[PDB]
Design a binder for this molecule. Structure first.
Ligand code: HEM
Length: 153
């Protein structure tokens, strides 16, 4: 359970992300795919991209970063009362996209790296800890729905 103060750290930084959703989404996905190449393989849409420059040139990849970050921002602004928003997400990522929970950990690491790079004066260690808590809470709740569907593994 995050405290009110921890939520405010989270949503303060997040409001900065909302100024440039597509740049951030691009940097996050590129960092995920470079750090953890197995992740790229989950996207038939992007598995043709072999170099970081081709990633950065891809309009389709920047479109998908905005999709991912808009859905994440909608969940964070619920401050933990996010069951309606996580259900469909977990359903599709377990049963259609086949994404292990561990790769949710990976993309959380990429999100924390990118936010430290882009917003260091709003993302000191208090805010980093908080955002880590927030992302852990998303992963706990998606993992519980995986388990329900037979995919926690
Ligand atoms: C912060 C975590 C994530 C969020 C908020 C998120 C959000 C979304 C949304 C909103 C969609 C489209 C709607 C849907 O299919 O449910 C989507 C599609 C998809 N996601 Fe995620 N995602 C996350 C993590 C990932 C990870 C880590 C992977 C792969 C490693 C991934 C793989 C996919 C794939 C394969 C699609 C379908 C894309 C396509 O071919 O159109 N997701 N994601």
């Amino acid at each position: 359970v995050l405290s009110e103060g921890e939520w405010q750290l989270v949503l303060h930084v997040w409001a900065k992300v909302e100024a440039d959703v597509a740049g951030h989404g691009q940097d996050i996905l590129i960092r995920l795919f470079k750090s953890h190449p197995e992740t790229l393989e989950k996207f038939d849409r992007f598995k043709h991209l072999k170099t970081e420059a081709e990633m950065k040139a891809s309009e389709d990849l920047k479109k998908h970063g905005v999709t991912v970050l808009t859905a994440l921002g909608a969940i964070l602004k619920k401050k933990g009362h996010h069951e309606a928003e996580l259900k469909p997400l977990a359903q599709s990522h377990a049963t259609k996209h086949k994404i292990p929970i561990k790769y949710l950990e990976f993309i959380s690491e990429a999100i924390i790296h990118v936010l430290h790079s882009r917003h260091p004066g709003d993302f000191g260690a208090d805010a980093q800890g908080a955002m880590n808590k927030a992302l852990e809470l998303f992963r706990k709740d998606i993992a519980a729905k995986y388990k329900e569907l037979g995919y926690q593994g």
